[PDB]
Design a protein around this ligand. Structure first.
Ligand SMILES: Nc1ncnc2c1ncn2[C@@H]1O[C@H](COP(=O)(O)OP(=O)(O)OP(=O)(O)O)[C@@H](O)[C@H]1O
Ligand SMILES: [Mg+2]
Lengths: 449, 50, 50, 50, 50, 496, 50
């Protein structure tokens, strides 16, 4: 099929598209949300916790950004499990209180389902309709959901990459929430910003990809860090051992006797049915299931539903659980061959354990250390170096530059890439905005219509 | 009776086997990766270590 | 004289002493010593007089 | 100096100087970025070794 | 001996293996005289049946 | 009611027919009519957690676990002293509790706990007008085992700044400050770990030691004496004799606990009040034996490495014969899921499994099993959801069959012809035929696996080409193999 | 404090001393610490004392 060939030469130019999107978002003025004090205090009283004083700062910054005429653009870069989502949920309440149709965009179906459950739990006493669209929904109810949204009756639409496919038309969109943004890519992150120019993008992540971290530290997007630890979170213990069946058995038995559950990440669908069958012979005391995104929907959904209700302990999974599945009882992740994983992926996988008052371990099994590559050694000696609460920002500012921030005006978020400077970019943006203010050049996206 | 001759063939064969260990490591890696039905014994084996 | 210098008295203590000699740290268990000793000199894969 | 084949000689002092400058500049960047203590301590050890 | 000592390469996933059948040394591209004249190795291409 | 209660030395009472998530409502029923505690002995720690989320749904009595060491037997990790603070505190309130359920698994019931002399020898109640000196209270806490810091944040630490002594007791979840004056306590004010300012002031407060073993110098000398009695010393500074004599503690020192006391550790059955009523689940003669076998296997596996050697498991855990000879001191209600035949001390409770209820979008009417089951049931029926939003996820699913469930808080509220809903972590439903009630959880609208994807009909497109596998092919005849493509057949061969 | 002039502390012992005596003591590590030790030293008085 001629894979060898390098196709054409940039079938499209992204500098002009991204420049026009930025210069149209920075030209006009967004919605100025109206904040209700004693009608939002009830929604705060629905929260069965207390906001830590660094998260009750990100929330205050988010609301005081939404209540201004400018179009919001923020990062909520706090470490894993620190209550990032509730910031988005309080932002979503302020948006939906003014009938503004929040749109939540998550990069996987398990996040779609879990955020659907969490949002439906939280907004369980208000006239707010919350709905999920992804491949887990059928082909006959997806068109019903799209008809409802275009009609203007679903006020929160949680979805995967389906939310960008040009047939999802929102009536009056007033807030976007991109959750776990480091798995999307630039085209996915402005595919909705192009249509609705002045939408308020709230962007939740734990380890940003270098482009949107340099872009946040350089003053293009606002930043709100959340390192403040929750009630009793404990530092997740990192062990980097060579693979050993006794080590695997000991870890799984230590978790089973405690009553928790185990993530056992294999990350290979072709051999996952053999890895689980082999692990079920190594540890007969465990109950083991398989979960990945390449098996049929009514099977993965039911397996991941059984895992919540403690119907088995070990779940041999791919990196579909890299994205932020909570499951507070699971407190031991065992990554089978962790040499080929990024720093962001490794820290995200380490973040899936903890989430509660328990002490949670994390084993990153490796091959024999002369058989690993050199970058794997540098990545593992960095993931094992940082084992502290709030280490998800130092790790991000290490990944950035270790890999370097990519093209600020183009694609390729991570890489040296010989990008243009920020001084040139701000001058170019101001030039485009000033040329567009006078002779109001219609939006290029509408030209696509 | 304590010292032994390593002539041309033995040393060359030992060096060939040393170079073949890296090759078998690479082949075992490619085999252990998934989706083997589209492969042939040329995509995994490289003649550069040998 | 060696037995009077020997700080062990049975098989398992001897195997654990060998294990601690080989790899300092890595707190010994019973299989981690027995398998190590049996794969040290008595395994066809990892030991070969020609 | 060149090797008359288009390639330059190793000149082992320039390699050591370049490594020292690399580690020192990286450590300056880590000091500017307010790096965590363990990372900057490792880099200071590597600069000492360089 | 080298091919029999290395092969068959069994995958760790547990689904496939790569076994060895035979080998054959092909005809050299040149022979000794123009190998000395051009300045290239007089070698035979090894061709193995995997 | 349907069954009396056991109140004697060791008389048993076996209850049968109890299906899934019926043990929870029976425990909640027993716990509200026995004037005394109930120590629920779960057969497995996982099940314990499950029961802790279920009984707390059906009742209002205090249902609490007993925090076990989260490690494994003879492990190399500390129990993370916060858990210790949740374990000591219960052991202080355990000899005097009058109502409630305390849930222990067999793993933690078979363990041996301090001597309660160490409880009410190292634990104090501090009132306002205490004439105790600053350094006297400091050395009291130092002998108890607390850690001297300057920035007390967690369990078992204390800081001193002249007359200002702030300690975090392991009784409460909040720290306190004392503000000494003339060698007397003037205030006992709670201060936050985030704002460091007073919230209010408590007249009398309770404090508890830092670890489950004594730590002061006399205790360390006792530990060394017991060690030189039992094991043997090696001169090497990570041996756990010369690592404790220095002052610090190793990782998993909690398993060398009987070395600090010079009195055998009580079986925790001493801690129970005068009138408890042990309630069982599953079986103990298979879980206790499995735990003893695993602990002995791990002791034999790990009772090597002469630096850090291990105590015998009879010094730390009850033998199974000991455990079953100590359960004979308490009345027991054994809940088991089978038909118990007939005798005294034996009762049956009609708790049939739920009929076939499931939802599937395949048919025109998905709620057909539900819409027919709810019509032909004369007693009440109570849906049980786990969350609040899930309630709406079931509140608008029953709107298709024209039924809106009124919410109740306790299952006793159910009238005769009622459709109700209540919130809690019950997993499986039941039909209580005794009072004709039904409980339908969320996982009883899903059913078994709909796994029918064994194969697809690949017999299509089979024409003359296939030739019905006559195998009369000649060499060189072209052949298609739909996986790979078109080749030339070249005969039959044998291979290894 | 209890700690004397140049008593070395292990990492765990430094955490212990930082929790327990977390006041203004100067316990550092590396060439900065060695340079501070050398710079805070008076040779003449030390010579007379020795
Ligand atoms: N102030 C708080 N105090 C105690 N617990 C909290 C607090 N804020 C949040 N939590 C809990 O911590 C958990 C964190 O889950 P959540 O998904 O909300 O954040 P997150 O895991 O960081 O986000 P993501 O899933 O995108 O990584 C939540 O289940 C919430 O119940
Ligand atoms: Mg989130």
């Amino acid at each position: 099929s001629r894979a060898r060939q390098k196709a054409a030469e940039k079938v499209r130019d992204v500098a002009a598209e991204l420049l026009d999107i930025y210069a149209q978002r920075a030209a006009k003025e967004g919605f100025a949300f109206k904040h209700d004090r004693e009608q939002y205090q009830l929604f705060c009283d629905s929260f069965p916790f207390e906001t830590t004083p660094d998260q009750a700062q990100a929330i205050n910054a988010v609301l005081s950004d939404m209540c201004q005429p400018l179009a919001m653009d923020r990062l909520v870069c706090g470490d894993v499990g620190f209550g990032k989502t509730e910031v988005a949920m309080r932002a979503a309440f302020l948006a939906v209180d003014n009938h503004k149709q929040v749109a939540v965009l998550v990069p996987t179906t398990l996040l779609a389902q879990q955020h659907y459950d969490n949002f439906r739990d939280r907004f369980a006493n208000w006239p707010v309709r919350i709905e999920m669209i992804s491949r887990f929904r059928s082909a006959k109810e997806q068109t019903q959901i799209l008809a409802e949204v275009a009609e203007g009756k679903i006020d929160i639409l949680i979805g995967t990459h389906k939310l960008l496919q040009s047939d999802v038309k929102f009536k009056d969109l007033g807030l976007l929430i991109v959750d776990e943004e480091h798995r999307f890519g630039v085209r996915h992150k402005e595919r909705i910003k192009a249509m609705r120019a002045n939408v308020d993008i709230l962007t939740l992540t734990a380890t940003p990809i270098p482009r949107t971290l340099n872009m946040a530290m350089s003053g293009m997007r606002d930043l709100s860090i959340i390192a403040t630890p929750p009630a009793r979170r404990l530092a997740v213990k990192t062990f980097v051992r060579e693979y050993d069946s006794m080590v695997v058995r000991e870890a799984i038995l230590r978790e089973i006797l405690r009553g928790g559950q185990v993530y056992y990440l294999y990350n290979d669908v072709e051999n996952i049915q053999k890895a689980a069958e082999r692990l079920a012979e190594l540890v007969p005391e465990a109950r083991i299931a398989i979960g990945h995104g390449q098996m049929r929907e009514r099977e993965l959904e039911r397996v991941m539903n059984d895992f919540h209700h403690q119907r088995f302990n070990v779940l041999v999974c791919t990196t579909i659980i890299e994205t932020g599945i909570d499951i507070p009882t699971a407190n031991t992740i065992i990554i089978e061959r962790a040499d080929h994983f990024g720093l962001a992926q490794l820290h995200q996988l380490r973040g899936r354990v903890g989430r509660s008052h328990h002490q949670a371990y994390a084993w990153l099994l490796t091959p024999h250390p002369k058989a690993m590559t050199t970058d794997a050694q540098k990545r593992l000696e960095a993931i094992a170096s940082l084992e502290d609460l709030g280490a998800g920002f130092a790790l991000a500012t290490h990944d950035l530059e270790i890999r370097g921030a990519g093209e600020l005006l183009g694609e390729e978020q991570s890489g040296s890439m010989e990008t243009i400077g920020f001084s040139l970019y701000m001058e170019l943006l101001e030039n485009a905005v000033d040329a567009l203010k006078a002779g109001r050049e219609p939006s290029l996206e509408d030209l696509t219509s | 009776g304590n010292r032994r001759i390593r002539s041309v063939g033995e040393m060359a064969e030992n060096q060939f086997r040393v170079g073949l260990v890296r090759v078998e490591r690479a082949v075992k890696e490619r085999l252990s990766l998934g989706d083997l039905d589209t492969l042939m014994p040329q995509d995994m084996i490289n003649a550069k270590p040998i | 004289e060696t037995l009077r210098v020997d700080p062990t008295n049975d098989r398992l203590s001897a195997l654990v002493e060998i294990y601690r000699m080989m790899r300092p740290g890595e707190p010994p268990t019973r299989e981690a010593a027995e398998s190590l000793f049996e794969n040290l000199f008595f395994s066809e894969d990892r030991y070969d007089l020609s | 100096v060149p090797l008359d084949g288009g390639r330059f000689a190793t000149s082992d002092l320039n390699d050591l100087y370049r490594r020292v400058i690399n580690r020192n500049n990286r450590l300056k960047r880590l000091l500017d970025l307010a790096a965590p203590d363990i990372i900057v301590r490792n880099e200071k050890r590597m600069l000492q070794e360089a | 001996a080298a091919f029999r000592s290395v092969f068959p390469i069994q995958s760790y996933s547990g689904n496939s293996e790569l076994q060895y059948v035979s080998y054959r040394l092909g005809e050299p591209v040149f022979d000794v005289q123009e190998c000395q004249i051009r300045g290239v190795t007089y070698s035979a291409p090894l061709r193995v049946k995997l | 009611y349907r069954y009396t209660l056991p109140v004697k030395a060791g008389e048993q009472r076996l209850l049968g027919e109890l299906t899934g998530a019926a043990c929870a409502t029976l425990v909640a029923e027993i716990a509200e009519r026995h004037a005394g505690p109930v120590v629920l002995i779960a057969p497995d720690m996982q099940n314990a957690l499950r029961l802790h989320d279920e009984i707390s749904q059906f009742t209002d009595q205090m249902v609490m676990n007993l925090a076990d060491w989260e490690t494994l037997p003879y492990d190399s990790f500390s129990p993370h002293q916060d858990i210790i603070s949740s374990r000591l505190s219960t052991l202080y309130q355990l000899p005097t509790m009058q109502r409630g359920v305390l849930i222990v698994p067999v793993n933690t019931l078979m363990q041996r706990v301090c001597p309660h002399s160490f409880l009410h020898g190292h634990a104090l109640v501090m009132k306002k007008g205490q004439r105790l000196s600053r350094d006297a209270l400091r050395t009291q806490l130092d002998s108890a085992g607390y850690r001297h810091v300057d920035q007390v944040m967690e369990h078992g630490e204390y800081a001193t700044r002249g007359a200002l002594l702030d300690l975090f007791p392991m009784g409460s979840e909040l720290p306190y400050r004392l503000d000494f004056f003339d060698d007397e306590i003037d205030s006992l004010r709670v201060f936050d770990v985030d704002s460091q300012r007073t919230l209010e002031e408590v007249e009398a407060i309770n404090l508890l030691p830092a670890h489950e073993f004594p730590t002061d110098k006399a205790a360390i000398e006792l530990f060394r004496s017991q060690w030189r009695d039992t094991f043997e010393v090696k001169r090497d500074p990570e041996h756990i004799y010369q690592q404790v004599s220095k002052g610090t503690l190793p990782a998993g020192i909690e398993y060398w606990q009987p070395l600090f006391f010079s009195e055998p550790l009580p079986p925790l059955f001493s801690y129970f009040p005068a009138n408890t009523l042990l309630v069982n689940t599953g079986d103990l003669e298979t879980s206790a034996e499995r735990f003893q076998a695993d602990t002995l296997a791990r002791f034999e596996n790990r009772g090597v490495d002469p630096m850090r050697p291990l105590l015998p498991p009879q010094s730390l855990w009850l033998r199974v014969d000991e455990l079953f000879s100590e359960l004979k001191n308490w009345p027991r209600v054994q809940l088991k899921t089978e038909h118990l035949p007939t005798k005294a001390a034996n009762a049956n409770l009609g708790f049939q499994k739920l009929p076939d209820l499931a939802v599937q979008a395949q048919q025109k009417a998905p709620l057909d099993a539900l819409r027919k089951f709810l019509e032909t049931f004369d007693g009440p029926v109570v849906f049980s959801v786990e969350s609040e939003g899930r309630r709406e996820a079931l509140g608008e699913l029953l709107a298709r069959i024209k039924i809106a469930p009124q919410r109740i808080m306790r299952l006793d509220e159910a009238s005769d012809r009622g459709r109700y809903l209540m919130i809690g972590a019950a997993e499986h439903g039941f039909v209580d035929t005794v009072r004709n009630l039904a409980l339908i959880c969320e996982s009883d609208l899903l059913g078994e696996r709909v796994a029918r994807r064994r194969q697809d009909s690949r017999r299509t497109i089979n024409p003359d080409t296939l030739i019905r596998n006559l195998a009369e092919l000649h060499i060189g005849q072209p052949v298609v193999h739909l996986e790979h493509g078109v080749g030339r057949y070249a005969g039959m061969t044998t291979l290894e | 404090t209890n700690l004397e002039r140049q008593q070395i502390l292990t990492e765990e012992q430094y955490l212990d001393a930082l929790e327990e005596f977390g006041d203004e003591f100067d316990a550092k590590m590396g060439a900065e610490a060695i340079q501070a030790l050398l710079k805070s030293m008076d040779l003449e008085q030390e010579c007379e004392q020795l």
